Amino acid sequence: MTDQAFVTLTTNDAYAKGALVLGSSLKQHRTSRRLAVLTTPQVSDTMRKALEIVFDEVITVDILDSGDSAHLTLMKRPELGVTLTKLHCWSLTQYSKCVFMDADTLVLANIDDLFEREELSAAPDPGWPDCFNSGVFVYQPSVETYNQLLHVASEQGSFDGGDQGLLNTFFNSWATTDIRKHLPFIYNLSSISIYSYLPAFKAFGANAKVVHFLGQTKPWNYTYDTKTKSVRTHPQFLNVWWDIFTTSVVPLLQQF
Amino acid sequence: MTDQAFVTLTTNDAYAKGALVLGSSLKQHRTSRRLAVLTTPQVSDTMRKALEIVFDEVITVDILDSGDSAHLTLMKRPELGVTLTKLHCWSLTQYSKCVFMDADTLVLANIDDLFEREELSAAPDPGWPDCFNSGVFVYQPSVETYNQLLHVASEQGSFDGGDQGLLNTFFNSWATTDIRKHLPFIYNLSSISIYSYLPAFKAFGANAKVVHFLGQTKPWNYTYDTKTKSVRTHPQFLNVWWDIFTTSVVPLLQQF
Ligand SMILES: O=c1ccn([C@@H]2O[C@H](COP(=O)(O)OP(=O)(O)O)[C@@H](O)[C@H]2O)c(=O)[nH]1
Ligand SMILES: O=c1ccn([C@@H]2O[C@H](COP(=O)(O)OP(=O)(O)O)[C@@H](O)[C@H]2O)c(=O)[nH]1
Ligand SMILES: [Cl-]
Numbered sequence: 001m002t003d004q005a006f007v008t009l010t011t012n013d014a015y016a017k018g019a020l021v022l023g024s025s026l027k028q029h030r031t032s033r034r035l036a037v038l039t040t041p042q043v044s045d046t047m048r049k050a051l052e053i054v055f056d057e058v059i060t061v062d063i064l065d066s067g068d069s070a071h072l073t074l075m076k077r078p079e080l081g082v083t084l085t086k087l088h089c090w091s092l093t094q095y096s097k098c099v100f101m102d103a104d105t106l107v108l109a110n111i112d113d114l115f116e117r118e119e120l121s122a123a124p125d126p127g128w129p130d131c132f133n134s135g136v137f138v139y140q141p142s143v144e145t146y147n148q149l150l151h152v153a154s155e156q157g158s159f160d161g162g163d164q165g166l167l168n169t170f171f172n173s174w175a176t177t178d179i180r181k182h183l184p185f186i187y188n189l190s191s192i193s194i195y196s197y198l199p200a201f202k203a204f205g206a207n208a209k210v211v212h213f214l215g216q217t218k219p220w221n222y223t224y225d226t227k228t229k230s231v232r233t234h235p236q237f238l239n240v241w242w243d244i245f246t247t248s249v250v251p252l253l254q255q256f
Numbered sequence: 257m258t259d260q261a262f263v264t265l266t267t268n269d270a271y272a273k274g275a276l277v278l279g280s281s282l283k284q285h286r287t288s289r290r291l292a293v294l295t296t297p298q299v300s301d302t303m304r305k306a307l308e309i310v311f312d313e314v315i316t317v318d319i320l321d322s323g324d325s326a327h328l329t330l331m332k333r334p335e336l337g338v339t340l341t342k343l344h345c346w347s348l349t350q351y352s353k354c355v356f357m358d359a360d361t362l363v364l365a366n367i368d369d370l371f372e373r374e375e376l377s378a379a380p381d382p383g384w385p386d387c388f389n390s391g392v393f394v395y396q397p398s399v400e401t402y403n404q405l406l407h408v409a410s411e412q413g414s415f416d417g418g419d420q421g422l423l424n425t426f427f428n429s430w431a432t433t434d435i436r437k438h439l440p441f442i443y444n445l446s447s448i449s450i451y452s453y454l455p456a457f458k459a460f461g462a463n464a465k466v467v468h469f470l471g472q473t474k475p476w477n478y479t480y481d482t483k484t485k486s487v488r489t490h491p492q493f494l495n496v497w498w499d500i501f502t503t504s505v506v507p508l509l510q511q512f
């Protein structure tokens with residue numbers, strides 16, 4: 001499918017590492033879809049070159065440029081900078097349907113069946129499960145939707161200072177409407193829950209399709225021993241991320 | 257409705273305090289339904305007498321008695337003692353439909369609209385939101401369902417050593433089937449989430465219909481200053497619980 005894509009985002013080199021691991025994981029599990037990444041000019045040439053290899057499309061978004069439609073909203077609401085760059089995922093009208101995935105996600109199994117879903121399909125957020133987590137969602141690119149999202153960001157901002165609040169407010173029927181728009185939690189399995197509700201993880205965690213490295217500490221904030229093949233609680237997913245980073249991404253960075 | 261009920265559970269005097277506050281809160285918000293409480297012989301005469309006043313029906317369940325259908329399962333799986341007592345909520349076939357509520361819940365608004373729901377309707381659990389939280393659920397009493405639940409408890413036990421695992425395993429279509437069986441989170445608002453995902457709470461918490469005092473520390477494990485009318489983070493709900501306990505329940509205990 002040349003008209004459907006996974007779309008991720010990186011505004012810097014650190015999240016580009018995640019993007020590269022995510023992209024690699026999607027290729028590893030043989031996606032039949034395109035891979036697109038929103039980037040900013042702050043992503044360095046080296047990360048960019050690697051992103052150009054891993055991804056089928058590298059889109060450059062610069063909301064610091066006043067030529068960008070979101071720039072005036074960034075001025076008004078700096079807290080929404082990442083959110084606003086993220087919203088440009090809706091501008092990818094070369095694609096008919098996309099799965100947005102946070103750059104701190106990791107694919108463990110083919111998830112092309114997400115493309116059966118409609119906008120807006122997303123997994124519940126742990127913590128407040130009547131909100132969906134915006135780290136993984138199925139959406140339909142549309143300039144109108146983009147404009148409407150931008151408009152809401154401008155007018156209301158986001159109840160949580162990020163995209164999740166914004167997306168939940170805009171797609172507010174999610175909690176009460178259409179169970180098919182609730183992506184199984186295994187398609188956006190928060191790394192925290194992989195020890196928060198541990199019995200549930202024991203019971204259902206082996207079904208994980210997507211791990212989402214929530215919280216302050218991202219996989220690249222860890223040190224990884226390449227000999228023992230383990231990072232420096234429950235490091236299983238961290239080690240998968242780092243195995244991909246070590247195996248696929250680091251050498252890729254070295255050929256550029 | 258004489259055939260529909262809120263059903264709670266207390267196996268001891270401490271949770272009887274919760275039961276009494278819950279029951280009082282349900283009366284406070286003018287439920288048109290019956291109030292039933294499952295109790296064990298371990299609930300003391302004083303708590304019982306108060307329970308007999310607050311609740312329309314006090315049911316005594318004794319799974320330590322070998323005459324109980326669950327007793328043999330308790331022997332096999334002691335971890336399920338509370339769960340097994342709880343399952344007897346399905347034996348309440350005097351009622352056509354019930355809302356089970358944990359004794360550590362607190363009603364903040366009329367929730368009689370829960371009786372529009374079918375078995376099994378429950379709110380998502382924070383932590384693993386493809387499980388429902390079993391602190392509040394709409395169910396239909398049935399000896400068959402009771403027997404089937406008991407059978408599963410006997411054969412598999414519970415993936416989390418409690419009722420939640422058991423109920424989720426038995427009612428396992430919940431996550432993927434019928435959005436109407438997802439009770440809004442506000443009908444079972446985990447006290448933890450009232451600081452875990454705090455922006456969401458700020459945004460939606462004022463809509464709270466039911467507060468669920470999750471975690472080790474229950475409202476009765478707090479000290480409450482009756483003069484300042486506050487307990488000894490975000491004590492709002494604790495103070496509501498204690499206002500009811502102080503105002504309604506304590507004097508009630510004193511008249512028995
Ligand atoms: O400084 C940042 C912050 C986030 N992001 C992107 O926006 C998403 C926001 O999710 P993040 O993982 O940062 O937040 P969390 O999921 O931990 O709550 C990331 O995955 C990245 O794709 C980015 O590129 N640069
Ligand atoms: O020792 C106990 C433990 C629990 N329960 C009942 O079973 C429910 C189990 O939920 P609990 O609040 O204890 O667990 P949590 O919701 O905190 O995970 C309680 O609300 C009570 O109704 C009880 O009566 N005695
Ligand atoms: Cl539905």
Ligand SMILES: [Mn+2]
Pocket residue numbers: 102103104105135212213214
């Ligand atoms: Mn993320």
Ligand SMILES: [Mn+2]
Pocket residue numbers: 358359360361391468469470
């Ligand atoms: Mn409880």
